[PDB]
Amino acid sequence: AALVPGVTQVDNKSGFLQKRPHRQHPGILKLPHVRLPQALANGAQLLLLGSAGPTMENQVQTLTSYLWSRHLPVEPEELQRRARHLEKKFLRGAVLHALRKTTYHWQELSYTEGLSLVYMAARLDGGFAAVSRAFHEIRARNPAFQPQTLMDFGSGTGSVTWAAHSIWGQSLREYMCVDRSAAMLVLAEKLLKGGSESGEPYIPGVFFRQFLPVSPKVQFDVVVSAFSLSELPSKADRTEVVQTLWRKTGHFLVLVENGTKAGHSLLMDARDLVLKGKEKSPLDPRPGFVFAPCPHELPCPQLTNLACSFSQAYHPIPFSWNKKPKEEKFSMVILARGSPEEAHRWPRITQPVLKRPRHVHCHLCCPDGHMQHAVLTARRHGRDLYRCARVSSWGDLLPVLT
Amino acid sequence: ADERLRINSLRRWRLSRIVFRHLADHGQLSGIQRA
Amino acid sequence: RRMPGQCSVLLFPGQGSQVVGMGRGLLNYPRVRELYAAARRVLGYDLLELSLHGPQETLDRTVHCQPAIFVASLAAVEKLHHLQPSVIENCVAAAGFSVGEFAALVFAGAMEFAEGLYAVKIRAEAMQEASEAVPSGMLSVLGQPQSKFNFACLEAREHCKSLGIENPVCEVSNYLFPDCRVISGHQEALRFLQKNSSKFHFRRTRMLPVSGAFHTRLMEPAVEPLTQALKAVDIKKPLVSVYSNVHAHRYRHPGHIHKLLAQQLVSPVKWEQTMHAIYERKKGRGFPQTFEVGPGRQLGAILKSCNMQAWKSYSAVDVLQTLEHV
RNA sequence: GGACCUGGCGGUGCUUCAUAUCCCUCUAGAGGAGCCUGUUCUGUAAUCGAUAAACCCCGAUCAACCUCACCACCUCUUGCUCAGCCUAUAUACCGCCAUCUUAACCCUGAUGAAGGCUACAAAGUACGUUAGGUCAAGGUGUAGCCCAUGAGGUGGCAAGAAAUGGGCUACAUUUUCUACCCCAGAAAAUUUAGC
Numbered sequence: 020a021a022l023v024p025g026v027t028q029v030d031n032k033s034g035f036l037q038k039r040p041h042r043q044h045p046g047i048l049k050l051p052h053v054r055l056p057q058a059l060a061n062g063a064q065l066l067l068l069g070s071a072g073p074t075m076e077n078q079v080q081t082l083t084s085y086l087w088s089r090h091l092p093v094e095p096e097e098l099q100r101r102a103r104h105l106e107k108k109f110l111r112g113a114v115l116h117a118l119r120k121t122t123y124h125w126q127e128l129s130y131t132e133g134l135s136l137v138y139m140a141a142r143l144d145g146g147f148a149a150v151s152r153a154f155h156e157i158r159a160r161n162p163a164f165q166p167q168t169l170m171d172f173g174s175g176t177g178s179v180t181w182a183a184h185s186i187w188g189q190s191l192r193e194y195m196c197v198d199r200s201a202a203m204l205v206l207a208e209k210l211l212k213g214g215s216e217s218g219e220p221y222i223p224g225v226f227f228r229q230f231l232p233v234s235p236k237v238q239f240d241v242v243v244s245a246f247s248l249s250e251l252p253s254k255a256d257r258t259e260v261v262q263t264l265w266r267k268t269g270h271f272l273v274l275v276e277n278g279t280k281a282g283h284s285l286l287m288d289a290r291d292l293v294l295k296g297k298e299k300s301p302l303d304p305r306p307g308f309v310f311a312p313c314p315h316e317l318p319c320p321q322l323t324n325l326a327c328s329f330s331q332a333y334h335p336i337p338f339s340w341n342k343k344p345k346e347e348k349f350s351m352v353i354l355a356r357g358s359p360e361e362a363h364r365w366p367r368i369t370q371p372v373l374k375r376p377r378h379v380h381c382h383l384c385c386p387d388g389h390m391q392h393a394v395l396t397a398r399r400h401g402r403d404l405y406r407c408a409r410v411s412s413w414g415d416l417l418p419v420l421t
Numbered sequence: 422a423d424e425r426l427r428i429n430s431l432r433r434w435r436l437s438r439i440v441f442r443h444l445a446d447h448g449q450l451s452g453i454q455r456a
Numbered sequence: 457r458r459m460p461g462q463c464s465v466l467l468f469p470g471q472g473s474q475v476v477g478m479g480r481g482l483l484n485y486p487r488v489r490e491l492y493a494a495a496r497r498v499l500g501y502d503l504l505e506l507s508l509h510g511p512q513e514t515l516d517r518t519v520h521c522q523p524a525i526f527v528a529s530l531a532a533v534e535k536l537h538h539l540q541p542s543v544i545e546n547c548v549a550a551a552g553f554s555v556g557e558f559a560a561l562v563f564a565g566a567m568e569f570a571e572g573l574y575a576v577k578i579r580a581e582a583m584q585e586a587s588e589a590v591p592s593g594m595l596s597v598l599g600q601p602q603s604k605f606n607f608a609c610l611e612a613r614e615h616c617k618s619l620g621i622e623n624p625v626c627e628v629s630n631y632l633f634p635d636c637r638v639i640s641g642h643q644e645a646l647r648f649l650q651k652n653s654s655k656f657h658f659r660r661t662r663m664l665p666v667s668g669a670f671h672t673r674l675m676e677p678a679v680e681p682l683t684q685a686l687k688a689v690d691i692k693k694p695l696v697s698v699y700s701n702v703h704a705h706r707y708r709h710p711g712h713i714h715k716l717l718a719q720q721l722v723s724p725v726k727w728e729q730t731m732h733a734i735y736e737r738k739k740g741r742g743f744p745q746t747f748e749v750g751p752g753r754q755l756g757a758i759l760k761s762c763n764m765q766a767w768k769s770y771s772a773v774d775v776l777q778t779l780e781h782v
Numbered sequence: 783g784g785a786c787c788u789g790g791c792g793g794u795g796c797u798u799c800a801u802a803u804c805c806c807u808c809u810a811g812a813g814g815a816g817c818c819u820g821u822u823c824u825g826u827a828a829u830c831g832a833u834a835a836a837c838c839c840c841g842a843u844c845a846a847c848c849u850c851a852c853c854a855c856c857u858c859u860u861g862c863u864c865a866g867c868c869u870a871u872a873u874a875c876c877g878c879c880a881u882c883u884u885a886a887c888c889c890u891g892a893u894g895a896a897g898g899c900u901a902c903a904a905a906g907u908a909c910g911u912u913a914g915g916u917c918a919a920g921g922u923g924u925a926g927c928c929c930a931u932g933a934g935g936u937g938g939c940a941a942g943a944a945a946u947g948g949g950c951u952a953c954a955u956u957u958u959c960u961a962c963c964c965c966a967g968a969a970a971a972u973u974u975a976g977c
């Protein structure tokens with residue numbers, strides 16, 4: 020509960036309210052509709068001139084829905100509890116058949132040359148928008164940050180590399196991109212060279228590797244994993260990767276997944292793993308804290324039954340099936356080295372803001388670790404804070420103190 | 422209703438398409454065959 | 457409510473439609489002699505003699521053509537009323553070109569005859585004085601798809617800047633129909649456009665026989681006179697939908713005709729937009745009858761270029777002769 | 783360490799041809815005018831925000847001199863009826879739509895890994911899932927505010943500029959108008975699909 024009617028007041032630092040309107044309040048983090056770079060948009064279409072007919076529309080849709088509805092692989096432990104429960108009810112072959120149903124069949128996707136094109140036509144634009152929104156968080160609240168180095172685990176189509184260039188292009192000097200699939204690496208380099216096998220890379224310093232380097236000595240300023248931890252075959256694999264990524268993180272670790280229950284639970288495992296440091300004597304002894312979106316390091320209050328996701332509207336790459344703008348629903352967590360900058364953390368709006376006559380509905384994750392459904396009105400809370408919430412939107416911060 | 426009609430003067434199966442298909446596809450709707 | 461096809465739209469001509477013999481064929485018709493007598497009363501000279509028998513050179517002077525066109529347009533309205541009462545009864549829209557707008561309002565019962573003549577007289581005199589103030593003119597240009605108009609205006613201004621003048625003027629002054637415009641400004645700029653048509657991709661160019669640059673900022677000195685003349689006049693609510701030229705939409709409230717009529721004096725004429733606002737409709741829908749009440753048939757050709765289908769049901773009121781001696 | 787067996791070669795090049803999808807080939811348009819929108823930038827204290835709820839009554843339509851929404855100011859409240867709000871919730875249920883998951887035998891090799899064909903013939907035969915959408919032709923509950931998320935009043939608000947995406951109109955001589963329904967008279971470059 021970070022909203023007490025009549026007690027909580029807006030936080031006026033930098034002499035905000037006097038010096039600026041309410042529509043530009045510092046908790047505003049909304050990003051206008053994302054347009055991809057023309058070089059990327061042109062390159063993607065050129066690579067698809069061979070086959071972009073009616074079959075491709077069906078293929079792109081099938082892949083998009085399949086990836087969206089994927090569940091995390093069922094760990095064995097979950098499997099025996101389901102097995103015994105069905106066993107007691109029946110009282111082995113019958114149980115297994117009843118276990119093939121009511122359980123999710125998780126399969127590896129071998130990203131070959133064919134399925135790599137379908138992925139690029141389905142997730143390049145969507146993935147780019149989600150990562151751009153995540154990076155906007157780091158820029159907006161810390162505009163002095165000028166990273167010189169970046170690593171991207173699970174670099175399928177290079178969306179992270181392009182998004183990082185659009186924000187920190189004047190200071191980044193190295194883009195390490197890791198991806199086990201040869202075809203995806205082949206596709207990602209074509210996209211940097213204007214969609215042709217021969218050309219000059221549009222971004223300088225991109226390094227492509229097939230295996231994740233494992234060494235605490237080499238440490239990157241921004242480590243990014245976007246829509247990649249969901250492709251790992253088990254929780255042990257996710258545990259090992261996230262530990263390595265954190266060990267090689269210099270300032271910020273940006274993890275982004277789908278805005279589903281499977282995605283959100285995945286990131287809360289990684290969030291707890293980094294926060295609950297287990298290494299006895301790490302090379303980098305600095306602690307970790309959640310830079311965004313959580314205003315606390317306490318357990319997620321929405322992880323029980325609900326999820327936590329955010330939305331970013333973007334303009335899809337022109338195709339035979341992309342006409343109207345789309346929305347990218349994603350889950351994110353950003354983990355930063357060091358300690359929180361100050362004690363004046365602000366609630367996060369984690370759900371669409373509903374504007375109604377003279378009152379506004381905001382669902383806030385508060386610094387104390389609890390969600391608060393606040394209906395803000397001018398009479399109860401005040402003219403200033405009501406106007407701040409009137410202009411706020413999904414994924415913004417609410418500047419409230421005491 | 423009637424009052425509304427008066428002042429104005431002074432101036433196939435009723436099922437969802439899918440439920441139709443299941444009944445139609447299972448032969449439960451008389452006379453509706455597939456071409 | 458009414459099916460399109462039994463209603464009618466009246467189009468009132470403007471500058472450049474005068475012709476010697478205008479008024480013959482309307483003189484015998486009802487009420488016309490009284491209109492011309494009132495025109496004599498208000499102006500101070502005989503429009504009837506000048507229009508029926510003139511040198512055409514006094515008739516081409518600005519001070520004389522505009523009131524003549526105004527009175528001839530209204531006389532044609534009475535002629536049409538005598539011939540076809542239903543058409544005047546079933547009138548949906550009205551529109552005038554430059555001075556014909558003053559006529560349309562008078563037909564719509566927003567102003568009275570004497571008020572309109574006084575306004576038009578002051579307007580014409582002030583416009584003639586403004587044209588005398590600085591040399592200028594207008595050019596009709598028909599372009600092809602590769603023609604850029606603002607571009608050509610820009611070099612038309614660059615040339616005269618190189619010659620040396622305070623703020624050379626050259627801009628599109630009339631939008632008539634697709635790829636046909638009238639540019640207005642200093643004669644040197646228009647001569648530049650004429651001699652560089654090939655570079656500017658202008659298929660045809662024709663200097664209009666006009667005194668000066670109408671519908672540009674060069675006529676700013678004439679704005680303040682007309683406003684005064686219009687201040688006394690109490691403009692009522694038009695009975696029919698009478699369209700404007702400044703922005704090409706139906707006048708909403710009478711309290712804004714006062715300033716829009718003076719703004720038209722120094723603003724381009726949105727004729728093509730008005731024709732669209734009157735005649736645009738889906739494929740297959742019927743079109744209203746169209747009557748060009750006044751001298752000439754220029755608006756007929758403009759309508760043919762703009763909308764052929766609407767032009768199919770177009771007719772012009774003869775103001776030079778009459779079939780039957782009433 | 784010697785000999786052998788099955789291999790896999792996530793294989794690599796050349797030769798020839800089948801070589802359809804895609805090429806060449808054929809038809810048709812798709813640049814330009816005028817307006818309405820999607821997104822961006824700028825600006826405001828504010829929403830070029832909406833009419834099972836207004837102008838508009840040729841087509842359409844904009845702001846209407848309407849009401850709701852917004853901004854700045856104010857007033858009342860035990861009020862209406864143990865009042866009132868459409869305020870949230872299908873991220874509560876149901877309904878409805880949609881996503882995803884759910885062989886044997888016989889021979890050969892000395893009875894080794896192993897192998898088995900010749901036609902004028904030589905061992906071969908037989909339901910769950912979803913921070914899903916929908917509160918408009920549908921329901922069952924659950925929460926909120928009640929000196930205001932209720933009821934009123936006084937003013938204001940009705941944007942500006944581009945680059946690109948889409949859409950609506952007219953665009954003619956093999957045409958147009960009248961009579962007829964075809965022997966008359968008067969006018970005047972890329973692409974995109976498609977067989």
Ligand SMILES: C[S@@+](CC[C@H](N)C(=O)[O-])C[C@H]1O[C@@H](n2cnc3c(N)ncnc32)[C@H](O)[C@@H]1O
Pocket residue numbers: 130142143146147172173174175176177178179197198199200203229231244245246247250251
């Ligand atoms: C779903 S794509 C991520 C897309 C990318 N983040 C983007 O925004 O476009 C995941 C990639 O991770 C790779 N991958 C899967 N398992 C991996 C592993 N164990 N180690 C390294 N890469 C892996 C896959 O080859 C695949 O290309």
Ligand code: SF4
Pocket residue numbers: 312313314318319320321322326327328367369384
């Ligand atoms: S912002 Fe709040 S609800 Fe979302 S993941 Fe963080 S703690 Fe959970």
Ligand SMILES: [Mg+2]
Pocket residue numbers: none
């Ligand atoms: Mg839902």
Ligand SMILES: [Mg+2]
Pocket residue numbers: 939940
């Ligand atoms: Mg408004």
